[PDB]
Amino acid sequence: KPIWTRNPDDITNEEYGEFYKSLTNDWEDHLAVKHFSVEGQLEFRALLFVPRRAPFNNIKLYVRRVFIMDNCEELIPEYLNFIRGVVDSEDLPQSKILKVIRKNLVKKCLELFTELAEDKENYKKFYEQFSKNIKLGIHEDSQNRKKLSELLRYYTSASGDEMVSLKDYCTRMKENQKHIYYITGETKDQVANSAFVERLRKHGLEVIYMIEPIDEYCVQQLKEFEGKTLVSVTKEGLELPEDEEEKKKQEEKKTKFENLCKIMKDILEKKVEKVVVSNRLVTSPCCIVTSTYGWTANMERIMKAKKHLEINPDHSIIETLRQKAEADKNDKSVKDLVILLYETALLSSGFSLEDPQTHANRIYRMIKLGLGID
Amino acid sequence: KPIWTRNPDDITNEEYGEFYKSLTNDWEDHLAVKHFSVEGQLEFRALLFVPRRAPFNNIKLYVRRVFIMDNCEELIPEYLNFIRGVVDSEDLPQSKILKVIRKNLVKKCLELFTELAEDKENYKKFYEQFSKNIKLGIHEDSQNRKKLSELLRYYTSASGDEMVSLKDYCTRMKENQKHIYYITGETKDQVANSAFVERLRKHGLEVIYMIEPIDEYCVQQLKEFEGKTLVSVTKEGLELPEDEEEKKKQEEKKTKFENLCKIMKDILEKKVEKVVVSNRLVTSPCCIVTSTYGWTANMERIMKAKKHLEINPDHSIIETLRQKAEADKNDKSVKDLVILLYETALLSSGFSLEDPQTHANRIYRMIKLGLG
Amino acid sequence: KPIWTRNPDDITNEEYGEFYKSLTNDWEDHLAVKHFSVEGQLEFRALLFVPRRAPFNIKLYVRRVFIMDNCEELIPEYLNFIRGVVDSEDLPSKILKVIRKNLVKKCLELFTELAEDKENYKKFYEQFSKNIKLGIHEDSQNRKKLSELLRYYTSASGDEMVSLKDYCTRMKENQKHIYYITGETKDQVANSAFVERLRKHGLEVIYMIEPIDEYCVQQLKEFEGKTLVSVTKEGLELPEDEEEKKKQEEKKTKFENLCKIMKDILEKKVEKVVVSNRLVTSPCCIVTSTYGWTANMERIMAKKHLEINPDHSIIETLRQKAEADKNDKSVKDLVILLYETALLSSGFSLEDPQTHANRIYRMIKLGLG
Amino acid sequence: KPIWTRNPDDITNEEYGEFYKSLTNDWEDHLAVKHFSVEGQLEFRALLFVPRRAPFNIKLYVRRVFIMDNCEELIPEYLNFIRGVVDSEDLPSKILKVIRKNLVKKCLELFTELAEDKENYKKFYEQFSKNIKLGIHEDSQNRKKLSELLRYYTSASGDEMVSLKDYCTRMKENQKHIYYITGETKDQVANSAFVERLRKHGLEVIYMIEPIDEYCVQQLKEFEGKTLVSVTKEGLELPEDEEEKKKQEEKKTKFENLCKIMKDILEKKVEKVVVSNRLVTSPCCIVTSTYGWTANMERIMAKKHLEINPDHSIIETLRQKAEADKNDKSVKDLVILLYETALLSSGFSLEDPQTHANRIYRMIKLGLG
Amino acid sequence: KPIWTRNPDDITNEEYGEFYKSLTNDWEDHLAVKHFSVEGQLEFRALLFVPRRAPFNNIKLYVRRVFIMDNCEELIPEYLNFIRGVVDSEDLPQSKILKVIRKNLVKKCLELFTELAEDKENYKKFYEQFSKNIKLGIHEDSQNRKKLSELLRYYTSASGDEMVSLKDYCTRMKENQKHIYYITGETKDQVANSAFVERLRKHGLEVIYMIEPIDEYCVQQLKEFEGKTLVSVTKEGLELPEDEEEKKKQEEKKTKFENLCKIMKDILEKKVEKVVVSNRLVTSPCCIVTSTYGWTANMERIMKAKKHLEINPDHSIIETLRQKAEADKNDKSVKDLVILLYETALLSSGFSLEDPQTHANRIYRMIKLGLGID
């Protein structure tokens, strides 16, 4: 009799929808249904629904077609709490059999979501509602992390205005390419045009643009996809596919600017840990990166710390400032220029001036020069 | 028999303290105590305590020595909800009886606070903990707003590392000074060294440093004190005491840069409503102020805006800029300059930029100029 | 797609009702519906229903997503019979009050349209007048709009209940005050001694005969200028001639001797006695000060003034009969008899109803031997 | 080591109190303490305290481990002023009742010892008599032990309140019933018409002058055999001579004519009138049936019988004065006057207190002209 | 000022005890105190107490010496909920920093418990109150399972009436001994005298006697100690240190009784999965064991299934019944004897007869023979 005891092949979409509206006092029908039964260990039937709109535990529990409760937070994990429906156990009596029901429900929900994905138009419709939940699942459900990660969709430097899957990112990977590059910030345009992605983008190396704050917490646990390790492009020591000749070309620029690097680190005092030669810049003269362990600019923005300033070996500014500096180490104008570079990189790398008026003053002095005063 | 029924001369702080710790399960004793009896139309008895530490309403109510309840909506308003103690009514056979109690408690609490504000040592302990509540009450409680305002203490451009009262501010007001000037920002240093206070500081017109967030909510309601209106130093049209001579000197500068203001506004088009000759700057070449009607940069940052660019007529950058722009109002370089100045002033005024990359690129183009 | 976001002029009463019943689990449909929207400030839509029967809340939506029902501060407590939904566009403490003020605005709007159609205002008012009155008591900003919904029986009005607007159309040129009385029965108050001279003068009196009425008029102080006055309390202003103003003077001194001598021999029982201008056929009545509790106030659980009738035979006799030779158990027997009888007639309880009953037994014992 | 497992004879009142105060957050110590143990069936210990002031529960331990305080069924609701601890040895629905019955046994034991010491029973009884009475009402198994704790004012007892045991020592040989009255004041009930003949006969009457009393006596039906009877209700048994039994017959027929003719002209107001054996000096009173609500029952919010006094002058006159020629506005005026006066004297309210007050105004108007 | 902010070296035991009684309205003082502070990541001080008696979350939370709450079930795991005390954070503002506080509290509680253990008289006093909690911890706190397992104490066939640690069990292990043997049942005597332990005990191989029901749930997750894997002696395929000669002696008894094993399995029909030759019996003629995965006799007793009947190669009864049976396979008296053996093993191995009267009848027939009737 009750709808969850009928054979799925029999029940129609109108029928389900009606049951759903009736179960949830929702004004519209479900977005997706998953309706199944498990055998042997425990016997149970389940009818699960995905709402059209994300809510701002509530599976109804039955035994032998008799209502028990629905406070049962043990049936599904926090992150799938948007799921709604009934579980009809063919008899439960410790109390942990509930774990076995939970695992099945997650199995099937993940199965449902995969199927939604294979419908490539209108996975949009689920994903724009529930990707926060996916991502939250990746953080805290280590057992299903891999499956959950196949459901993610992102903007990438290759994707234009489409969100693409990690699987697709992988099939486009280059040859010596060993790593999945990502960036986290507030906007697609803000990251696309960032100093950190200039060189990857010039060489056709694809960057995932993670542009929602949950992403910060998500990448914390998403270490890898298809055995390729995910690397942040705003952290120290960006590693990128090396040629037998670039690795030599690098160490050659490294010891070239080793000197200027040492004088720069000297005056920048305790504002920066290291001053290294960059491997991620083309047009931008320098940038600020943060240590492998630590807080990013995006994270300090959410907080409402170990910096490295990377210089660009091939930028005229840096290049000439290597002349000036090795000519006169303690020179008062190199000093204020070094800070001004630093201060500029700070801003354009997502950070926030310790004192913005001293920075203002620094600009003022410079433009006073510009206009030919002093 | 119970302590609150005893006569306040016969009770010692050691005894009051012991009661308080019993009452509230604290590990330390109270900071202050008010034990009073209202006699007359409705007689009742109250023993009130201020804690030494602000907690993360909570008054026990008794009728004729018999406990009734403690979760009592509107025995005191929310802003005084830190007070703890008991009220023992001598007669009771939701109502309007509670209004009488509520007014009495609120009088005596404000009484206690004024008293505490002698003994300067101890007011520091109280205010350090409960400044927020005093302010929260100025916003909500109009019947008491003036008493609440005399309890306020602030860091000012005159005061050093001590915080002073509004009364004291007033004792130092100049001649022809009609306004109390305040700035609101994140830190004392930030505000004390903001472009907005340069000239007030030079003339020795005191400025109040408002550096807590509640202050933004608070001055929304503290309109004036002791007949003198409070004015923000970051909003348009800063009025100053100005001698007959100086006014004539300010008017010359207005028309001398009447032209530069015009061309600057044209270039800055959509980003600025008005550019004006400043009266508030000395060392800085310009700053950004917000329309009187609109809302600030301190406020924009607390969410977790009509602008004026004021320009310093006595500044080398500005006096040089006049010359260059009047020589060619279309010089792409004058333009690049103006936008630089605008961006830098925007940063200096607590605003965040539209696109910190383009601003950075500007800087770079420049620092590549003065180098080859 | 949901009903509250559909255009109100498309939606029919069977649909509203289907929705109402479905929202509330009522078996009968709603009694009134108000479906409006708001713009500018804060855009939102509301669908509010008035149930047919008094009880003893509101579903809040943001962008068509359910948030909560409980929401303690959406309508004020006196309008909590109202069921419905509010759907907000832009809502991400201080702004709920913006919603609360609009919802109340449109409820009162609804109630005013409801009042226009008499052949059915009855159905509303019988059920929720208590709420209106509780409204006047607790809500100051709308006290005025709320009192125009009040309906009362009056001296002028027989079996119907009329409005204060209505009362006012019937006021007389000189009349500055709206006169009311509080009691337990329509009959009881209409035949009371207080109304007599007012009625004789053609000045309408409102019969307030719910207990709630006693609590409501604490705060309802005026209407269209005019101030309200109980007829059971000391000091009653009454439009007076230059002629009658001269004549009310006569009595307050002719009977002043009696007024000094009557309270003299009634102390502990009643405190001060004056000439009464509210009396025609009755010889005395107790009025109840201004601070002091009234006979109907005290009932739902002190300060009595005896007012005697100048032009009454009983009073005129008992004047000169007392004035010369101020004693004998008989002059005392009647003065006590006037107090007690006046005290029951004004709706009070004698401490001992034997001291009164035995007195009737003395009066009846020598009515025949 | 904890106090409730220590031997009661070691532990001092300062310790009990220190414990009590610490248990309850009272500022003053306990008023009574009962510390007992139980064996056999189910071993357990209890420490129970009686607070000095009435409120407006019990910590349960098993093997010295805390379980819960709330425990809804440890003492019955009427004994919920009692604070304390119960510590059980063997407790691993049906057995809590075994504890509940023992705790009540020892509470009543405590209250009985409390009553032995008069120079302090006052302190208990003033505070918790309401609870005792609520006990009689709800707890049948202990109704008897509970009524021996009841203390009342009586006709016989002046300014003191006595027990029913005490009442019984003063009963007369022939007396089968315990007579009580319910009213609002001691004075009010002692001077009431109902008590007159009982008092004259030397039969003690209990003055029950709390409202709660009205509710309590619903279920308190007897004591030491003797049954209780209200003096404000129809049919009052009274020890009678062979002589007086013959004489009460005279009146019930002499006045039967009047009894037929009096109810004839009082219908809607009162239903049936008989000769009264509760009256001496008063001429009439209303009694209130057996089903029907009484004047004091109706007060905390119908079926009245007029009982007239045979040996009264007013009644004897009004007999033959009516019998021959049964009319004139005067015979009616007095019969109505007897009803109303009898109705206020019995503690009722007239529908309109003007119909009565005007009648006094007719009687007084020709008491002098 | 407050006791948890004072230096432990300063506060006395009387002082702590008093604070404790006052914090818990407990009539007696604490059994143990642990009082510490953590630095850097978050700063906080904590004062934790162990009660004398097991209760039938309640750490009080403070920030900058200001009370916050105590419902905070995130501060310690279910199984340590008997712990009572205060946590004073030097400022907490997501909300998951709580995890970092939790880990510290568990670290320290486990540290406390270890110290209690090193006091070898009067660890009794903690352990008899809280071993259920230890064991519950082993089930569900996989990260600390190893440390938690060092706290366990058991009766063993070697220990007499002392409870001993797994570490001690290990230092007594034999030479080819690779495994920690245990048995679960209701009583020390019931397990000591069980058929399953006869041979281990004859050879000096030590058996842990697990005699509380939580043990059943505990061994479910306690796979190993010091790299030695725990094996149940009531399960199929007891493996025991093999000599170059016993392994041969076994396979020799195996094929000897291979025949009788097949006829026995034949009549015992679907009551038993296998009938094998035993390797755990000396005096007892046979016994019932249950499959590696499955339910034990003890577990079916808690439920208010795959059996193997092992025969004893050296028991006269079995030995002669191998003669009788290979002489007459389908003989009616061998049949009823085979069941009677089975039925007896069922009872003495913790199980419960499907039909006890048919068993009774079986005995009756036998004793009717005994008395010489039939």
Numbering used by the authors:
A (entry chain B), E (entry chain B): 294 to 349, 359 to 395, 405 to 615, 630 to 699
B (entry chain A): 294 to 349, 359 to 395, 405 to 615, 630 to 697
C (entry chain C), D (entry chain C): 294 to 349, 360 to 395, 406 to 614, 630 to 697
Recite the paper's sentences.
Heat shock protein 90 (HSP90) is an ATPase-dependent chaperone and the molecular chaperone functions as a dimer. The conserved HSP90 structure consists of three domains: an N-terminal (N) domain that contains the co-chaperone binding motif and an ATP and drug binding site that binds the natural compounds geldanamycin and radicicol; a middle (M) domain that is responsible for binding to co-chaperone and client proteins; and a C-terminal (C) domain that contains a dimerization motif, a second drug-binding site, and a conserved MEEVD pentapeptide at the C-terminus, which is recognized by the co-chaperone HSP70/HSP90 organizing protein (Hop). In this study, we determined the crystal structure of a human HSP90 that contains the M and C domains (MC-HSP90) in a hexameric assembly. The structure reveals a hexameric assembly with triangular bipyramid geometry, in which the building block is a dimer.
The N-terminal truncated HSP90 (MC-HSP90, residues 293–732) containing the middle segment and carboxy-terminal domain was crystallized in three different forms, C2221, P21 and R32. For the C2221 and P21 crystals, obtained under similar conditions, the protein solution was pre-incubated with cis-dichloro(ethylenediamine)platinum(II) (cis-DEP) and cisplatin, respectively, before crystallization setup. All crystal structures were determined by molecular replacement (MR) method, but only the C2221 and P21 crystals were refined to 3.0 Å and 3.05 Å resolutions, respectively, with three and six molecules of MC-HSP90 per asymmetric unit. The refined models of MC-HSP90 in the two different space groups of C2221 and P21 contain nine independent polypeptide chains in total. The other crystals, the C2221 and R32 crystals of MC-HSP90 and the P6322 crystal of MC-HSP90-Ct have fewer than six molecules in an asymmetric unit, but they also contain this kind of hexameric assembly in the crystals, suggesting that the hexamer is not just a result of stabilization by favourable crystal lattice contacts. In the absence of the N-terminal ATPase domain, co-chaperone and client proteins, MC-HSP90 structure contains several disordered regions, which correspond to four functional loops: an amphipathic loop (residues 347–360), a middle segment catalytic loop (residues 395–406), an extended loop (residues 616–630) and the C-terminal tail (residues 698–732). To confirm the presence of disordered loops and C-terminal tail in the crystal, the C2221 crystal was harvested and dissolved for in-gel trypsin digestion and MALDI-MS analysis. In this experiment, the N and C-terminal tail segments and the residues comprising the amphipathic loop, as well as the extended loop, can all be identified in the MASS spectra. However, in the catalytic loop, only the residues 395–400 could be identified by our experimental procedure.
